Amino acid sequence: MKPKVVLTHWVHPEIIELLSASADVIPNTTRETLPRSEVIARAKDADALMAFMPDSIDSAFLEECPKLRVIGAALKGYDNFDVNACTRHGVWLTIVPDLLTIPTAELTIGLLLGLTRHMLEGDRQIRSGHFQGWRPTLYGSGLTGKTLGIIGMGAVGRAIAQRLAGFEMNLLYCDPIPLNAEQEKAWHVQRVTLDELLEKCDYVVPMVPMAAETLHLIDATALAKMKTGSYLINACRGSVVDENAVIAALASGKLAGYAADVFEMEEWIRADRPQAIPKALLDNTAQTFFTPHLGSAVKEVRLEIERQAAMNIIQALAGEKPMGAINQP
Amino acid sequence: MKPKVVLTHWVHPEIIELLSASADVIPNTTRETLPRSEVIARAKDADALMAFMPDSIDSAFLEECPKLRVIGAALKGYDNFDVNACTRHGVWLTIVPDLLTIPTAELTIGLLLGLTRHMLEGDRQIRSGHFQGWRPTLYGSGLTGKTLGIIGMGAVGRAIAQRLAGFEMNLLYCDPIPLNAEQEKAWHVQRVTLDELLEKCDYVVPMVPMAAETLHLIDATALAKMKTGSYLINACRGSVVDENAVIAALASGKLAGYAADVFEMEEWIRADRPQAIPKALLDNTAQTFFTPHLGSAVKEVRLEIERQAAMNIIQALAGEKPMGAINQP
Numbered sequence: 009m010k011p012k013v014v015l016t017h018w019v020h021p022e023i024i025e026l027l028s029a030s031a032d033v034i035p036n037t038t039r040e041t042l043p044r045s046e047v048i049a050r051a052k053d054a055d056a057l058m059a060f061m062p063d064s065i066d067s068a069f070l071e072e073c074p075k076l077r078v079i080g081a082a083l084k085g086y087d088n089f090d091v092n093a094c095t096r097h098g099v100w101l102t103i104v105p106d107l108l109t110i111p112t113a114e115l116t117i118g119l120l121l122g123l124t125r126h127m128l129e130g131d132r133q134i135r136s137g138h139f140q141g142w143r144p145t146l147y148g149s150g151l152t153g154k155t156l157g158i159i160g161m162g163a164v165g166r167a168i169a170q171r172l173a174g175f176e177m178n179l180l181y182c183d184p185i186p187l188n189a190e191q192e193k194a195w196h197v198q199r200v201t202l203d204e205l206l207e208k209c210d211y212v213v214p215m216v217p218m219a220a221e222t223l224h225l226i227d228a229t230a231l232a233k234m235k236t237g238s239y240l241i242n243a244c245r246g247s248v249v250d251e252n253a254v255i256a257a258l259a260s261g262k263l264a265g266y267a268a269d270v271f272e273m274e275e276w277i278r279a280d281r282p283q284a285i286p287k288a289l290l291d292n293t294a295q296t297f298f299t300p301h302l303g304s305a306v307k308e309v310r311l312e313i314e315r316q317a318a319m320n321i322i323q324a325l326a327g328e329k330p331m332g333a334i335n336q337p
Numbered sequence: 338m339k340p341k342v343v344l345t346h347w348v349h350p351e352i353i354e355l356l357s358a359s360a361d362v363i364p365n366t367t368r369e370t371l372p373r374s375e376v377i378a379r380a381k382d383a384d385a386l387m388a389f390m391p392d393s394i395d396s397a398f399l400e401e402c403p404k405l406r407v408i409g410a411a412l413k414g415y416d417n418f419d420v421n422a423c424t425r426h427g428v429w430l431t432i433v434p435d436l437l438t439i440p441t442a443e444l445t446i447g448l449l450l451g452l453t454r455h456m457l458e459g460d461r462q463i464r465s466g467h468f469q470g471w472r473p474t475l476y477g478s479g480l481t482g483k484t485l486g487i488i489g490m491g492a493v494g495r496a497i498a499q500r501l502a503g504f505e506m507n508l509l510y511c512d513p514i515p516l517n518a519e520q521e522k523a524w525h526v527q528r529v530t531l532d533e534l535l536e537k538c539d540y541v542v543p544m545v546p547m548a549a550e551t552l553h554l555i556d557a558t559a560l561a562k563m564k565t566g567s568y569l570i571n572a573c574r575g576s577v578v579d580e581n582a583v584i585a586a587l588a589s590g591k592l593a594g595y596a597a598d599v600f601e602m603e604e605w606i607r608a609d610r611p612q613a614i615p616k617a618l619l620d621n622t623a624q625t626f627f628t629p630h631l632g633s634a635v636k637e638v639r640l641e642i643e644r645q646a647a648m649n650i651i652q653a654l655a656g657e658k659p660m661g662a663i664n665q666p
C-alpha cells in the first residue's frame with residue numbers, strides 16, 4: 009500500500025500529480041484553512057504532511073499522528089513547529105529557503121507607491137463614473153529626492169535596496185551587521201543608527217525578524233522621533249509595529265500614512281492579541297493601504313514553494329535525507 | 338529507430354553502454370563544456386538530454402528542441418532549469434539524490450591539512466630540485482589540542498565532525514537545532530553560539546545546510562570577531578564567504594590562511610556576482626589553497642550520479658514516470 013500524504017491547504021494540480029506517483033494524496037480542495045480538528049482527523053494515519061503557515065505542529069498534534077515520517081513545510085520560518093518534538097517523534101521537518109524574499113520586496117515597493125500616490129482612492133474615483141479629466145486632488149508624495157530608511161538590511165532589505173537604487177532617493181539603513189563597501193556603493197545606501205534613521209526619513213520600512221527585542225519596535229516612542237508627515241510601510245511581521253500607536257500617530261498627523269501586509273491579529277502565539285484588525289485602521293481608507301499577507305502571493309513562486317515541499321516529502325518517504333531538513337529524527 | 342540522447346558533458350563509458358541498450362547516444366567526448374549553440378545543435382532532434390551543473394535550460398532552449406521528452410539532470414538541485422517551462426513544453430525534469438556529503442567532508446579536511454601544513458609550497462620546493470634534507474622551514478599549525486568550529490550542523494557538518502573526532506581537537510559547532518546527545522558524546526563536539534564559536538576557534542569551517550544558507554555569513558564583522566592567526570576553510574558555497582573581506586583579513590594578519598573549493602564567481606542566480614576569482618587571492622600562494630569545485634570529484638560518486646540520471650532518462654523514454662521527477666509534464 010502507498011503511504012498517505014495530507015496537504016493542509018490548496019496546491020497546484022501538478023503538485024498533487026507529482027506526489028501521486030509515490031503516495032496517495034489527500035488534498036484540501038478549497039482555498040480555505042481547515043479547522044485543526046479536521047487537519048488532525050485527515051493526518052491521523054498519514055505518513056507525510058505538507059504544512060503551511062496556519063498549521064501549529066506541537067506535541068499534541070504529533071501524538072495524534074503516530075505514522076508521520078515527514079512534515080514538508082511550505083514555509084521558510086518554522087516558529088509554529090516544535091522541532092524537538094518532531095525529532096523525538098521520529099518526524100523529519102523540512103523547510104523551503106530563499107523563495108519568499110523577492111516577491112515580498114516587490115510587494116513592499118507596491119505598498120509604498122500605492123500609499124504615497126493615493127492610488128486606491130484614485131481607483132475609487134474612477135469607478136464612481138464621475139471622472140471628467142484632471143482635477144487638483146489626490147496630490148501625493150514623490151520618491152525622488154526623499155529619504156527612505158530600511159530597518160534590518162537582510163534578505164528582503166537587500167532586495168528592496170537593490171530595487172530602490174534606481175529611484176534617485178536618499179537611502180538609509182540600520183542593522184547590527186553592516187553591508188560591505190561594494191554593496192553600499194552599488195545601491196547608494198548609507199548605514200546609520202535606528203535613532204538617526206527615524207529622525208531623517210520620509211519613509212520608514214521595517215524588515216527585521218520578530219524577536220523579543222523587536223516586539224513593538226515601532227511604538228509610540230519610535231513614532232515620536234519620526235518626522236511629521238512621514239509614512240510607515242510594514243510588510244515584515246504583525247507585532248513589529250504597535251498598531252494602536254500608529255492609529256494615534258495618524259490621528260495627530262505624525263504619520264501621513266500607514267501601509268501593511270501583516271497584522272498583529274495574525275500572531276496567534278502571543279496571549280495579548282486581538283482577533284480583528286483595529287476598526288480605526290480599516291475605516292481610514294484615505295491614509296492606509298492593506299494587503300492580506302500577499303508577500304509571496306505570486307503564482308510561479310507559490311508553485312516552486314509547493315514543489316520544494318513535495319520533493320522533501322518524496323525524498324524522506326524514499327528513505328533519503330530530505331534536502332530541506334532542519335532536524336534529524 | 339531508437340530515441341536519441343544527448344549528454345552535454347563527459348560520462349563514464351559504462352554509462353554510455355547502459356544508455357545504448359535503449360537509445361542512440363550522442364556523447365561529449367571531451368572534458369570541456371560545449372557552447373550553448375552546440376548543445377542546441379545536438380539536442381534539436383533529441384528525445385532526451387542529460388544535463389549537468391554548467392547547463393541552463395530556459396524556454397528559448399526548449400523551443401529549439403521540439404522532440405525532447407526528458408531532461409535527466411545529473412544534479413541534486415535544479416536552480417539552472419526553468420521547471421515550469423519544461424512542464425509547459427511536455428518535458429520531464431529529473432534530479433538525483435544528494436550523494437555529495439562524504440566526499441565533500443573528506444575534501445574539506447584535505448583543504449584544512451594542506452593549508453595549515455604548507456603542503457603546496459612544500460611540493461613546490463621538492464620539484465625545484467633544491468631539496469637537500471630537513472630544514473627549519475615551512476613550520477605550520479597542527480590539529481591536536483586546537484579548537485575547530487563547524488558553523489551549521491547538517492549532513493556535511495556531521496560527516497566532518499565524525500571524521501575529526503579522532504584528532505584530539507576541541508570541536509565546537511553552532512546550529513539553531515542541536516545534535517543528538519549520543520552524537521555530541523560520540524564525536525566530543527560542543528554546541529556554542531556563533532559569537533562564542535568565532536571567538537574561540539583556531540579553525541572556522543562554515544558548512545550550513547541548504548535550508549540555512551545566507552549571503553556573506555563570514556563577512557568583515559565575523560572576521561573581526563575571529564582569533565588573530567585563525568584559518569578559514571570554505572567548501573560550502575561561494576556566497577557564504579565575503580571574499581574581499583577575506584583578502585583584507587589576510588592582508589592585516591587576522592587570518593593566517595584561507596582554503597576554498599567554491600567561489601563567489603559561481604553564483605549565477607545572484608545578480609551582483611563576480612566573474613573571476615579575485616587576483617589578490619590567486620596571487621597569494623603562501624596563504625591559500627584552492628580546488629576547482631572538487632568536493633564530489635570522486636569516481637564512485639560521479640559514476641553513481643551519472644547512473645541515476647541515465648536510469649531516469651531510460652524510465653521516461655519508456656513511458657514511465659521517472660523516479661527522480663520534480664514535475665508532471
Ligand SMILES: NC(=O)c1ccc[n+]([C@H]2O[C@@H](COP(=O)(O)OP(=O)(O)OC[C@@H]3O[C@H](n4ccc(N)nc4=O)[C@H](O)[C@@H]3O)[C@@H](O)[C@H]2O)c1
Nearest residue numbers: 108112160161162163164165183215216217243244303304
Ligand atoms: N510579508 C511577507 O509575506 C514576508 C515574507 C518574507 C519575510 N517576511 C518577514 O519575515 C522577516 C524575514 O525577513 P528576512 O530579510 O528574510 O530576514 P533576515 O535575512 O534574517 O533579516 C535581516 C536581519 O535584521 C536583523 N536585525 C535584527 C534585530 C535588529 N534590532 N535589527 C536588525 O537589523 C539582522 O541583522 C539581519 O540583517 C522580515 O524581514 C520580514 O521580511 C515577511
